[PDB]
């Protein structure tokens, strides 16, 4: 997916990233799933360990928290949808060790 | 915006007032556990205010 | 000092010239008037330096140090009146004049402008302090302790005349510390080692080491009437500042042999603190405390390179007020119990509740409560010798841990029950006992408000 070549700037704290850092990434399906935006990743104050997948839905999930100020829950179905984006991403990553027990052994 | 932390400094000041009144400078008819409890009693709503501005 | 020695010498033809018991209230009255004149003409600015008038004063420019020298004479007369009033009036007035004469040499000292006037003033003391130990002291074994009070300081100081005149005839003249611009370096030889040796060893006689310090718990143990000159003996020990004058120049580069003065003052530092947890004397209890964190400053000086001169400026006055205040606590609780042994003082804290606050804050200056004048300098000794190496924090930190016990080892001795005895010790802490107990922390935490004046060049 990411990490082609040549980080030109001298920016440490690797926010100057190739596209976006995954957990490990990709590996198989899909081999490239891109990410979101990076001009607003640094403009809007979004900390590290948050430049992973399902980010633009989270940037909008965090919009209605401020946009509904005396509120206890902005949209409770959206937290179940950001988690469904998260959990389906994680189960997509859970297919590594079934592949690793299969593909790495002799055949 | 200046009153974000200004109420904190008021909270960080009225604790000295039972200490300033320990010097017997026209002190209250003693009731000192009662007077201290009143001194804490008004600081809490003062402490409650800038918590709302932080979470916005 | 234009006219600082000049008003205080006129105080001397006023003791025997005066009337009867008016001599105490008169002597204290004039004495505080000089204290403003000390504050006024000093504390000026300030950028290298204030050469004051002439060949007798350099105005104490880099380190002020002189305000503390002038509190004590209007501070001990109220203390010495505890047990002195039993003699003839002409004999009591002589005891007043000799303490006033002690200040006048020390008024010219600490400024001194020179070095050949330094040593004659560096030795101008020890004449009045010795007489105080001989007459109107305590019980016997005084006279050997008077001899141990000699024969060390005089034994080590005599090669300074061997050293200084050897400098005066060789390179220029030591009248001026500010004509010390040309200074030749000193290489390693077998002649130059002794040249540095005599230059330094006399200053270890006064501020002590793990060696040669047996005399120090004699004058403080066998001591005058109720801590009378013992408070002056605090300034007598800290007043060995002249290493700051001398070894700043005049063979600075000999540090190859600095190490046995670093090491001996370091394992002896941690040792002499624990050498008194089984001591049975009150006046010896503060005495061995006064060795330890007074031995802290020596490694701040032989190690050069400031962030070490900063704290060492303040650590001289650190116990200088504190141990003077602890002796005021120990001078009290002796007019009421006529033995200084600490174990007999079980069952306190109930008869005297008013001075019990003063026990708390005094011993709270050894734990020292980091917004004070004590832990503001000890952090800079940390800031210096950790750049030396990483090991030095260990032995120096345990010194901050042993005196944590060693101070509260005294506080808990006040709290006991039923007291078994004491149809005497009735007196509920009269005015002289607590007003004199004040004026110690009252300038001390006052100096902690803006501690800018307590700073060297540096």
């Amino acid at each position: 997916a990411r990490r082609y070549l040549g980080d030109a700037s001298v920016e440490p704290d690797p926010l100057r990233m190739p596209t976006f850092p995954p957990d490990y990434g990709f590996p198989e399906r899909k081999e490239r799933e891109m990410v979101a935006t990076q001009q607003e990743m640094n403009d809007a104050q979004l900390v590290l360990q948050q430049r992973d997948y399902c980010a633009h839905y989270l940037i909008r999930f965090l919009k209605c928290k401020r946009d509904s100020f005396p509120n206890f829950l902005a949209c409770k179905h959206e937290r179940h949808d950001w988690d469904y984006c998260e959990h389906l991403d994680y189960v997509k990553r859970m297919k590594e060790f079934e592949r690793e027990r299969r593909l790495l052994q002799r055949k | 915006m200046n009153m974000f932390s200004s109420l904190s400094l008021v909270t960080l000041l009225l604790l000295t007032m039972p200490i300033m009144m320990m010097s017997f400078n026209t002190y209250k008819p003693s009731n000192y556990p009662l007077y201290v409890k009143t001194a804490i009693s008004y600081a809490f709503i003062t402490s409650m205010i800038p918590t709302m501005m932080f979470i916005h | 000092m234009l006219k600082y020695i000049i008003p205080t010498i006129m105080l001397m033809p006023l003791t025997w010239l005066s009337k009867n018991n008016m001599i105490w209230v008169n002597s204290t009255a004039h004495s505080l008037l000089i204290s403003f004149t000390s504050l006024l003409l000093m504390n000026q600015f300030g950028d290298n330096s204030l050469n004051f008038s002439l060949l007798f004063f350099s105005d104490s420019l880099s380190t002020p140090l002189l305000i503390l020298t002038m509190w004590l004479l209007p501070l001990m007369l109220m203390a010495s009146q505890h047990h002195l009033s039993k003699e003839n009036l002409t004999r009591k007035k002589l005891f007043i004049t000799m303490l006033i004469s002690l200040q006048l040499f020390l008024i010219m000292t600490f400024t001194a402008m020179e070095l050949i006037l330094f040593y004659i003033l560096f030795e101008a003391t020890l004449v009045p302090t010795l007489i105080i130990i001989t007459r109107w002291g305590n019980q016997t074994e005084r006279l050997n302790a008077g001899l141990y009070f000699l024969f060390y300081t005089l034994a080590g100081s005599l090669p300074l005349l061997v050293a200084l005149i050897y400098i005066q005839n060789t390179v220029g003249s030591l009248n001026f510390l500010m004509l010390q611009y040309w200074v030749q370096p000193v290489h390693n030889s077998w002649s130059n080692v002794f040249m540095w040796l005599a230059c330094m060893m006399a200053f270890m006689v006064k501020m002590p080491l793990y060696g040669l310090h047996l005399w120090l718990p004699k004058a403080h143990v066998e001591a005058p009437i109720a801590g009378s000159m013992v408070l002056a003996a605090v300034l007598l020990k800290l007043g060995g500042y002249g290493m700051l004058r001398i070894t700043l120049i005049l063979n600075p580069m000999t540090d190859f042999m600095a190490y046995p003065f670093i090491m001996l003052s370091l394992w002896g530092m941690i040792m002499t603190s624990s050498i008194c947890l089984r001591q049975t004397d009150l006046k010896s209890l503060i005495a061995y405390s006064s060795v330890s964190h007074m031995a802290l400053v020596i490694v701040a000086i032989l190690i050069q390179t400031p962030w070490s001169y900063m704290g060492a400026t303040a650590l001289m006055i650190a116990h200088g007020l504190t141990s003077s205040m602890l002796f005021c606590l120990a001078n009290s609780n002796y007019e009421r119990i006529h033995s200084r042994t600490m174990i007999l003082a079980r069952g306190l804290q109930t008869l005297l509740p008013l001075m019990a606050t003063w026990w708390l804050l005094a011993s709270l200056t050894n734990l020292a409560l980091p917004p004070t004048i004590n832990l503001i300098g000890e952090l800079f000794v940390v800031m210096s010798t950790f750049s030396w190496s990483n090991i030095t924090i260990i032995l120096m930190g345990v010194n901050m841990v042993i005196t944590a016990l060693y101070s509260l080892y005294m506080l808990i001795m006040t709290q006991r029950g039923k007291y078994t005895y004491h149809i005497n010790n009735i007196s509920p802490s009269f005015t002289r006992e607590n007003a004199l107990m004040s004026l110690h922390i009252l300038p001390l935490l006052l100096l902690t408000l803006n501690p800018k004046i307590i700073l060297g060049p540096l």
């Binding site: 990709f26 590996p27 060790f97 593909l103 790495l104 052994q105 | - | 089984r278 078994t420 005895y421």
Partner: protein, 141 residues
């Protein structure tokens, strides 16, 4: 001003029966198990006749001790053996010497070898061979 037997002297065999008790009554008539023989071993700078040490010791512990005050607080007259170590120290409890705490601290000494192992959650152990396959071996396709 007490000069007669004001302290100890160069003992301990200068007619030790005439030591206790012509003065300094640590023993009654030199047979009380506290006659001034107990100069530990002398030659050193220890105590001489010394109304001092190896008398019955290890605690004044503030007992019940009603026949006088007599324990540690209230001044019995002349029974000084040793001091300045006992205002904070005590006698024997019900258990005995057994240093089981080092064996109790040895419970992690077995698991100190377990500190070398790893702690991955999934999958299970299957500790038989290299079929566990931890890291990345092959490429995408």
């Amino acid at each position: 001003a007490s000069h007669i037997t004001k302290d100890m002297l160069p003992g301990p065999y200068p007619k030790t029966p005439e030591e206790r008790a012509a003065a300094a009554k640590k023993y009654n008539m030199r047979v009380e198990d506290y006659e001034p023989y107990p100069d530990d071993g002398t030659g050193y700078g220890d105590y001489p006749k010394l109304p001092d040490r190896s008398q019955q010791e290890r605690d004044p512990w503030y007992d019940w001790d009603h026949p006088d005050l007599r324990l540690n607080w209230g001044e019995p007259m002349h029974w000084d053996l040793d001091m300045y170590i006992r205002n904070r120290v005590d006698t024997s409890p019900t258990p005995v010497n057994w240093n089981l705490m080092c064996k109790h601290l040895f419970g992690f000494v077995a698991f100190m070898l377990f500190m070398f192992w790893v702690g991955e959650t999934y999958p299970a152990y299957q500790p038989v061979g290299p079929k566990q396959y931890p890291y990345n071996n092959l490429y995408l396709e």
